[PDB]
Write a protein that binds this ligand. Structure first.
Ligand SMILES: *C1=CC(=O)N(CC)C1=O
Ligand SMILES: *C1=CC(=O)N(CC)C1=O
Ligand SMILES: [Ba+2]
Ligand SMILES: [Ba+2]
Ligand SMILES: [Ba+2]
Ligand SMILES: [Ba+2]
Ligand SMILES: [Ba+2]
Ligand SMILES: [Ba+2]
Ligand SMILES: [Ba+2]
Ligand SMILES: [Ba+2]
Ligand SMILES: [Ba+2]
Ligand SMILES: [Ba+2]
Ligand SMILES: [Ba+2]
Ligand SMILES: [Ba+2]
Ligand SMILES: [Ba+2]
Lengths: 77, 254
């Protein structure tokens, strides 16, 4: 019921411990804060596809230790 | 053997009335699972395609595909005779040269039968689902109506322009000029008022207002409108109906 996710860009890896039913918004906020960045400026990707903030680990079938890539959001387009 | 039976002749009259706006001839592709009302306007610019599905009828038999070309003036003439609460049944055999319209009144009362001669509609219909388009957007029908009706007052041409996250209708003229910019927009409390946009390519296409004016009449039958544009093919305007489905295909202006 509580999977453990690793979020990372190029230079920084963090571990969040969230509940399978908690929407992923909480975690994207938390990773973007710990970088003094805004959540809109970062693009979170799981196993290829771009995570939507409203989606939950349950929805995406995230097992323990799965990796969320964070990339910068380009302004165009 | 074809036996297409509407509960009320008013439903069929409503379809015939609708087409009567754009086209003068209609070609009824009757198939096992429904009828496809194909039509080309008189300038061969606008194409109408209407899917009347099995569930639209009270009883529907088609043992073999038939094509029923009918003059919409003549067809209207017959339609006047029967009552709106009459049961209408279209009867044709396989390989038909004429068609029978049976109006029937309830309890086992009264049967009124009228014949109509089919015409041959030769030219092949070019309904293009088009495997791929440059841009696809959907929006409320009322909203799309409002825009088209306003800008047509400014010109006979309306240009549609899609960029990343922007849809822009523009009409420049001789009295004045005008343009609406609308953006992707979702609302959970009122989902039927959303604007959806998908882009793979910017699009810049000019359209005749009189045609767009014909198209927007589809909103009286549906509350959303799909618009799929591409620089190679005619534009596709789609409406979802209980009957089935409505599709307009429009050639851009030179
Ligand atoms: C032209 C307007 C319309 O609603 N239709 C189909 C019913 C047309 O062909
Ligand atoms: C249907 C009613 C009628 O009077 N007529 C003759 C023109 C019909 O075809
Ligand atoms: Ba954005
Ligand atoms: Ba998995
Ligand atoms: Ba699995
Ligand atoms: Ba995995
Ligand atoms: Ba952006
Ligand atoms: Ba007209
Ligand atoms: Ba029914
Ligand atoms: Ba039925
Ligand atoms: Ba009458
Ligand atoms: Ba009846
Ligand atoms: Ba015959
Ligand atoms: Ba002009
Ligand atoms: Ba439907």
């Amino acid at each position: 019921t509580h999977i453990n996710l690793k979020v990372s860009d190029g230079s920084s890896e963090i571990f969040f411990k969230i509940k399978k039913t908690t929407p992923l918004r909480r975690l994207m906020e938390a990773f973007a804060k710990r970088q003094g960045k805004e959540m809109d400026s970062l693009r979170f990707l799981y196993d290829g596809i771009r995570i939507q903030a409203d989606q939950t680990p349950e929805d995406l079938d995230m097992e323990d230790n799965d990796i969320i890539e964070a990339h910068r959001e380009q302004i165009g387009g | 053997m074809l036996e297409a039976k509407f509960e009320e002749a008013s439903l069929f009259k409503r379809i015939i009335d609708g087409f009567k706006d754009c086209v003068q001839l209609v070609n009824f592709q009757c198939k096992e699972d429904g009828i496809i009302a194909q039509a080309v306007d008189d300038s061969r610019v606008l194409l109408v395609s209407l899917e009347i599905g099995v569930e639209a009828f009270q009883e529907y038999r088609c043992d073999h595909p038939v094509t029923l070309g009918m003059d919409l003036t003549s067809l209207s003439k017959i339609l006047r005779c029967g009552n709106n609460t009459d049961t209408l049944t279209l009867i044709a055999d396989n390989t038909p040269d004429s068609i029978i319209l049976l109006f029937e009144d309830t309890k086992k009362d009264r049967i009124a039968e009228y014949s109509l001669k089919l015409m041959d509609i030769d030219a092949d219909f070019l309904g293009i689902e088009e495997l791929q388009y440059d841009s696809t957007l959907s929006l409320p029908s009322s909203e799309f109506s409002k825009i088209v009706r306003d800008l047509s007052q400014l010109s006979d041409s309306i240009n549609i322009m899609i960029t990343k996250e922007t849809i822009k209708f523009v009409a420049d003229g001789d009295i004045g000029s005008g343009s609406v910019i609308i953006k992707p927009f979702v609302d959970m409390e009122h989902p039927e008022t959303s604007i959806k946009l998908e882009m793979d390519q910017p699009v810049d296409l000019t359209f005749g207002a009189k045609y767009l004016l014909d198209i927007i009449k589809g909103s009286s039958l549906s509350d959303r409108v799909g618009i799929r544009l591409s620089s190679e093919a005619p534009a596709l305007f789609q409406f979802d109906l209980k009957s089935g489905f409505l599709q307009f295909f429009l050639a851009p202006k030179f």
